[PDB]
Amino acid sequence: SDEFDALRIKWATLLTGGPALDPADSDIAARTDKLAQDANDYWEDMDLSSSRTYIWYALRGNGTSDNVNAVYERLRTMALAATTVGSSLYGNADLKEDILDALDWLYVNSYNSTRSRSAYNWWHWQLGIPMSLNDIAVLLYDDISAARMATYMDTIDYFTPSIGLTGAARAWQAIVVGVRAVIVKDAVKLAAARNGLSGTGIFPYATGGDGFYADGSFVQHTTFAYTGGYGSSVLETTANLMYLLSGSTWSVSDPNQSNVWQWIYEAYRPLLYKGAMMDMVRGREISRSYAQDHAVGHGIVASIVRLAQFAPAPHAAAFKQIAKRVIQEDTFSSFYGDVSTDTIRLAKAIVDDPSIAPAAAPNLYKQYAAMDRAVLQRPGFALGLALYSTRISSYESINSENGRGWYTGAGATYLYNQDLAQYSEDYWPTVDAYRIPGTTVASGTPIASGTGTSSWTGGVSLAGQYGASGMDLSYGAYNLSARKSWFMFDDEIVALGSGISSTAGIPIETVVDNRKLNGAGDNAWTANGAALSTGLGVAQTLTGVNWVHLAGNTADGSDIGYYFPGGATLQTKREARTGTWKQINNRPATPSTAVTRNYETMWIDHGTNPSGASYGYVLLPNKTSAQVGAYAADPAIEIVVNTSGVQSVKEKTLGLVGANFWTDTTQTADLITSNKKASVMTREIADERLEASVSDPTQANNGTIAIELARSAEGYSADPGITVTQLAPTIKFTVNVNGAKGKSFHASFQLG
Numbered sequence: 060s061d062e063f064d065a066l067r068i069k070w071a072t073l074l075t076g077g078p079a080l081d082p083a084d085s086d087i088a089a090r091t092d093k094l095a096q097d098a099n100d101y102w103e104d105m106d107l108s109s110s111r112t113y114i115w116y117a118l119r120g121n122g123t124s125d126n127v128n129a130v131y132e133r134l135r136t137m138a139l140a141a142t143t144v145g146s147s148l149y150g151n152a153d154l155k156e157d158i159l160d161a162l163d164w165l166y167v168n169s170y171n172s173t174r175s176r177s178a179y180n181w182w183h184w185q186l187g188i189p190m191s192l193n194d195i196a197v198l199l200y201d202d203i204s205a206a207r208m209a210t211y212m213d214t215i216d217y218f219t220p221s222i223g224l225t226g227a228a229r230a231w232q233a234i235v236v237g238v239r240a241v242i243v244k245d246a247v248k249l250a251a252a253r254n255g256l257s258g259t260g261i262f263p264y265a266t267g268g269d270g271f272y273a274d275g276s277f278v279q280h281t282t283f284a285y286t287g288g289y290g291s292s293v294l295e296t297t298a299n300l301m302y303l304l305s306g307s308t309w310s311v312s313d314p315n316q317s318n319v320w321q322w323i324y325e326a327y328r329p330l331l332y333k334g335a336m337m338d339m340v341r342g343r344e345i346s347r348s349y350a351q352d353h354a355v356g357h358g359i360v361a362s363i364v365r366l367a368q369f370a371p372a373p374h375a376a377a378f379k380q381i382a383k384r385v386i387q388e389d390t391f392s393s394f395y396g397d398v399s400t401d402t403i404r405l406a407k408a409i410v411d412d413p414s415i416a417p418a419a420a421p422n423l424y425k426q427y428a429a430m431d432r433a434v435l436q437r438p439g440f441a442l443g444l445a446l447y448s449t450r451i452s453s454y455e456s457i458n459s460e461n462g463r464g465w466y467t468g469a470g471a472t473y474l475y476n477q478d479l480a481q482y483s484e485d486y487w488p489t490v491d492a493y494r495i496p497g498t499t500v501a502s503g504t505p506i507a508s509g510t511g512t513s514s515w516t517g518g519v520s521l522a523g524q525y526g527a528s529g530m531d532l533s534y535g536a537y538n539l540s541a542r543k544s545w546f547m548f549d550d551e552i553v554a555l556g557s558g559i560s561s562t563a564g565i566p567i568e569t570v571v572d573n574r575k576l577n578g579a580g581d582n583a584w585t586a587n588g589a590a591l592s593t594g595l596g597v598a599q600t601l602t603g604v605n606w607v608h609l610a611g612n613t614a615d616g617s618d619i620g621y622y623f624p625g626g627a628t629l630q631t632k633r634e635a636r637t638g639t640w641k642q643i644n645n646r647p648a649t650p651s652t653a654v655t656r657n658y659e660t661m662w663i664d665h666g667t668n669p670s671g672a673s674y675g676y677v678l679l680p681n682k683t684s685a686q687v688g689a690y691a692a693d694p695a696i697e698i699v700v701n702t703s704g705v706q707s708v709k710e711k712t713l714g715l716v717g718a719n720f721w722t723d724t725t726q727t728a729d730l731i732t733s734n735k736k737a738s739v740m741t742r743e744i745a746d747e748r749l750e751a752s753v754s755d756p757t758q759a760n761n762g763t764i765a766i767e768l769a770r771s772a773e774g775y776s777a778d779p780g781i782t783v784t785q786l787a788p789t790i791k792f793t794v795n796v797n798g799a800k801g802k803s804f805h806a807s808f809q810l811g
């Protein structure tokens with residue numbers, strides 16, 4: 060034997076779980092049965108005639124990349140079932156041979172070097188198919204003759220002989236070149252595969268373009284927030300290749316590989332909520348039925364488990380603790396239910412190890428400035444905010460996918476609570492895409508896929524504990540502008556809207572919320588203390604509303620409260636909406652089955668052609684009806700200002716004052732004065748100290764932000780970049796934001 064055979068067997072185990080794959084393990088056996096069934100189902104439908112014109116009738120068309128890719132996937136599934144201990148197909152020679160004959164038929168009639176490397180869809184021809192074929196070759200290696208291996212591997216080398224792309228594509232090329240290298244035993248190619256990981260969009264942090272950013276963000280395709288879509292792919296592929304090579308002659312030696320640990324801590328951990336990977340960072344993949352938030356999260360944990368296998372201390376350990384917690388948290392979808400048998404094996408080992416304790420749940424406010432995203436994690440809930448600007452696109456839609464993604468990133472708020480299923484169970488193909496929670500739009504009117512014309516999108520973070528975001532709205536498809544802010548405190552989030560103006564001639568509205576209800580659509584809900592009808596199909600206007608309470612889809616942990624300072628008039632409707640995934644993902648393989656989900660939708664009508672309109676509401680997660688009423692009677696927050704010049708909210712109980720200044724002119728919000736566009740938050744501890752965080756969300760200020768605070772200080776300390784010019788009678792300092800890329804600068808002043 061040689062180190063190649065050693066590596067080959069290493070990858071094979073990664074695919075099957077290995078010989079020690081305890082078939083007695085409940086979950087393993089369950090997974091191995093689902094596997095064997097799918098294989099049997101395909102095998103029984105195969106056209107085994109030597110004169111066949113296709114492998115499967117439902118996937119015919121030797122030139123349709125979508126179909127060919129699917130054909131290879133099936134053959135891959137069949138191979139696994141034929142090589143996974145415990146499978147009812149393990150070692151079945153007939154299956155093995157039928158699979159190899161299929162590959163030969165495909166080589167002759169579809170996948171070979173006479174085809175164009177760039178024919179639609181190039182992705183299938185260069186990455187998708189090779190990844191499946193390599194896996195098959197590795198699994199049925201022993202039963203593959205030289206003559207056959209040649210046709211398989213020679214074809215892959217033709218389509219993808221090297222690594223030259225970036226981000227996910229580059230990683231996919233690396234794993235393609237790598238596994239083939241192990242198969243044909245090409246040390247040169249194998250080394251190139253290893254080096255591939257050091258390229259753009261992978262190990263090294265990006266300061267622009269595709270890749271992981273130092274602030275935790277992930278971008279793909281230049282302007283799209285993609286941590287949970289393409290980022291998940293880079294993570295999975297990077298983890299699989301690193302683990303494979305680890306300890307071998309071609310182990311990854313690039314020091315930047317430690318960046319990988321940060322992706323988990325900073326890029327993923329904050330965007331996970333009890334097993335779900337937030338959709339706001341999944342791009343057009345939200346329109347994929349097989350990749351709903353929990354299915355995706357399970358994939359990310361699988362990757363964390365893969366890294367735990369070779370990562371150094373104290374990372375391997377932390378990875379296990381994070382994985383454990385997530386697996387225990389997700390009571391919607393069994394983590395073991397949709398991951399590899401090897402993942403299950405390595406995961407059960409972590410979960411069943413009493414010495415490993417579940418990591419603490421994240422608790423913070425984080426500003427993903429590089430990708431116009433922000434997140435708040437608290438006990439019982441998490442709020443995700445998706446924005447867009449001149450740097451980040453509204454939404455992505457290519458290959459007929461995500462056709463209604465319009466407002467999924469235009470000031471859209473995503474609330475995560477104990478209703479783990481909220482965004483899964485066909486939320487995307489049924490929800491009214493024109494009414495994404497938190498957004499302000501021209502009623503029933505879409506917008507284009509692309510960046511905006513405003514750079515003021517981002518926010519400030521106060522020690523990662525609290526924060527505030529803002530977005531300068533101005534759509535290109537039609538006329539509509541506004542200043543939208545969000546202030547994230549401890550148990551509430553305050554959304555402010557000002558200067559909402561339009562000449563479009565289309566009724567303008569701001570969505571307070573749009574939640575998928577229980578199967579019966581009978582969730583109880585109240586307004587000002589009076590129960591509201593729970594019937595489906597009923598529309599109703601609520602006038603002079605101070606507060607609304609909506610009972611969650613779980614006995615507790617998912618209720619949502621809404622407080623309206625100064626009262627409001629809400630337009631609402633509870634209805635059963637029908638749709639199909641094909642409607643938002645028009646690809647041949649997409650299921651067209653109809654689904655029906657219930658929704659409670661609430662929004663503010665700003666009328667047609669409003670001028671300087673505004674709004675203000677507070678999201679009170681998990682509070683009961685009584686608690687919302689109690690809050691409403693003596694609210695913890697207070698709106699300091701809500702003009703097109705400055706939006707400011709104070710949180711009385713915490714001594715917090717947040718303010719978003721929208722212009723480059725001196726303005727004042729409570730104790731805070733700023734001379735330029737800025738996002739600011741202060742925390743005042745009576746007669747002791749005043750904390751302050753400042754950021755330039757535009758990421759375009761090449762000088763400073765001059766801030767003044769209406770308090771007299773004795774002393775201070777501040778992050779580099781900040782220069783204090785005065786402490787008494789008032790606090791004055793400037794913030795050097797040239798090249799800050801939307802980061803927050805902190806300062807703490809000793810009052811006295």
Ligand SMILES: [Ca+2]
Binds near residue numbers: 549550695696712
């Ligand atoms: Ca509070």
